């Protein structure tokens, strides 16, 4: 079996995967954490019985393009909002092949993971919300697994891409433009939000404790995680939560994939 921290790819066009360790962690946010929102409790411990892999980066534009070429799929255009349009998977801002894939809805992510699974003979899927927070924290209990930038009160521009140019980028940055966390994972605290599988809940009362996704038979809203290029760093904290309708897409939502070992 592959040791935690091992980085591998199942094919040339496939996302770079990193093995996360089995173990437990505390999910959610302490009451007094700066910026904490009300849906980030209760704090509750979640257990991953087995190691599993996630993409160390958000899936890239070039990686998505490889899928589009292989399958012939055309992604639907997105929501009205002048200057922020998604057209067949492409945002309006300049987007090179190592910037994150965006302008995909929830089902598009599932389709990409199904294609990857068939091509590789491995089991690819969406991350669960718990897996995503686990991977973001990499053992850390506070809002960030890295220190604040020296010289300002609450700046993370040395570690993440958030609103404005102080981090080098107005829009998204190539994946891996900042240091990784202790699990070998990049961009968990900025760049783009990410789809995860879970249906939306306004709290963690009754949340699953085994690393699974918290599903409902019918869901108008699903969870998204992380924080995007246009948002302030107060929402980059590891425990920040948000949601979208699964048919939504935007130039600010991308995704990771996970792989069973
Ligand atoms: Ca920025």
Automatic annotation (TrEMBL):
InterPro entries: CTDL_fold, Sulfatase_Mod_Factor_Kinase, SUMF_dom, SUMF_sf. Residues 14-259 form the Sulfatase-modifying factor enzyme-like domain. Disulfide bonds join 11-14, 86-103, 199-219. One of its GO terms (biological process) is pyoverdine biosynthetic process. It holds the Pfam family FGE-sulfatase. One of its GO terms (molecular function) is formylglycine-generating oxidase activity. Ca(2+) binds at residues 161-162, 164, 167, 169. Keywords: Calcium, Metal-binding, Signal. This is PvdO.
């Amino acid at each position: 079996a592959k040791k935690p921290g091992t980085v591998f790819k199942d094919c040339k066009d496939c996302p770079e995967m990193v093995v996360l360790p089995a173990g437990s962690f505390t999910m959610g946010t302490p009451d007094d954490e700066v910026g904490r929102q009300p849906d980030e409790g209760p704090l509750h411990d979640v257990t991953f019985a087995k190691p599993f892999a996630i993409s160390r980066y958000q899936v890239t534009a070039g990686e998505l393009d490889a899928y589009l070429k292989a399958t012939g799929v055309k992604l639907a255009d997105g929501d009205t909002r002048p200057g922020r349009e998604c057209i067949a998977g492409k945002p309006r801002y300049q987007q090179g092949p190592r910037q994150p894939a965006v302008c995909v809805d929830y089902n598009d992510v599932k389709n990409y993971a199904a294609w990857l699974s068939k091509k590789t003979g491995k089991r690819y899927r969406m991350l669960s919300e718990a897996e995503r927070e686990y991977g973001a924290r990499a053992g850390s209990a506070g809002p960030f697994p890295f220190p604040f930038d020296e010289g300002k009160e609450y700046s993370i521009a040395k570690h993440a891409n958030t609103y404005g140019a102080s981090d080098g980028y107005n829009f998204t940055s190539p994946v891996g433009s900042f240091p990784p966390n202790a699990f070998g994972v990049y961009d968990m605290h900025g760049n783009v939000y990410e789809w995860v599988a879970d249906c939306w809940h306004d709290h963690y009362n009754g949340a699953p404790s085994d690393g699974s996704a918290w599903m409902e038979e019918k869901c108008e809203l699903v969870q998204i995680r992380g924080n995007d290029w246009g948002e302030p760093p107060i929402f980059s904290r590891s425990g920040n939560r948000n949601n979208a309708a699964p048919s939504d897409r935007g130039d600010w939502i991308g995704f990771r994939v996970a792989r069973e070992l």
